[PDB]
Design a binder for this molecule. Structure first.
Ligand code: J4Q
Ligand code: J4Q
Ligand code: J4Q
Lengths: 156, 39
């Protein structure tokens, strides 16, 4: 299968035609996406099979072929880019200054950008092009708009 | 069976469209991975 680093669409043929259920990141031979995109199921890349390696429903993350590799973090000051990969549409960078989710366990960056659900798993990047987390797990706010956490895993 | 298709390189784009606000929100995270607003 294709193992080149990059952003990939996650597709299914179970529903009508070919439907994009989410997005993910290939880095260092490991495929990274959100748990709610695949539910932990195996994936196909051409004639190759990608088996789940690690996952956690509460973090809403899953890695395939190896352990989670992404470890960059939002600096808490600078604008970032969402590399949005919407269903049927070209990958497109959107620049934004993250807000904050304040929780009882600490603060997390958050991005107030609206995309279809099949965009979940798209990467958020810093100015060095490092993936600081994945877009797609968040909240609906007072005016119906969407705010996503910048969800990042832990590199063991 | 779910399958993957490459969509691009992961790179910062100079002069990308700039949008979105930066809300500061009190939130809770449950055991099922769902975020909710605390008010
Ligand atoms: C949010 S949505 O479901 O209407 C949508 N459908 C395709 C893309 N988008 C996102 C978008 C880009 S600019 C304004 N909305
Ligand atoms: C605002 S919402 O959560 O009700 C929603 N309805 C359609 C799409 N989404 C947003 C989204 C983008 S990535 C994960 N969820
Ligand atoms: C509040 S916001 O500006 O983040 C937003 N509101 C609807 C969609 N998005 C993101 C966007 C705007 S133009 C292309 N993408």
């Amino acid at each position: 299968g294709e193992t080149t680093d990059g952003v990939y669409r996650v597709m299914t043929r179970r529903l009508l035609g070919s439907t994009q259920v989410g997005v993910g990141v290939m880095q260092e031979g490991v495929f990274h996406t959100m748990w709610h995109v695949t539910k932990g199921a195996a994936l196909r890349s051409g004639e190759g099979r990608l088996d789940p390696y690690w996952g956690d429903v509460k973090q809403d993350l899953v890695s395939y072929c190896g352990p989670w590799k992404l470890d960059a973090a939002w600096d808490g000051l600078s604008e970032v880019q969402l590399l949005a990969v919407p269903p049927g549409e070209r990958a497109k960078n959107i620049q934004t200054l993250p807000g904050i989710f304040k929780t009882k366990d600490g603060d997390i960056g958050a991005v107030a950008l609206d995309y279809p659900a099949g965009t979940s798993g798209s990467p958020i990047l810093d100015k060095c092009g490092r993936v600081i987390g994945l877009y797609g797990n968040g909240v609906v706010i007072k005016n119906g708009s969407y705010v996503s956490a910048i969800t990042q895993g832990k590199r063991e | 069976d779910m399958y993957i298709e490459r969509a691009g390189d992961i790179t910062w784009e100079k002069d990308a469209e700039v949008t979105g606000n930066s809300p500061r929100l009190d939130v809770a995270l449950d055991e099922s991975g769902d975020f909710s607003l605390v008010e």
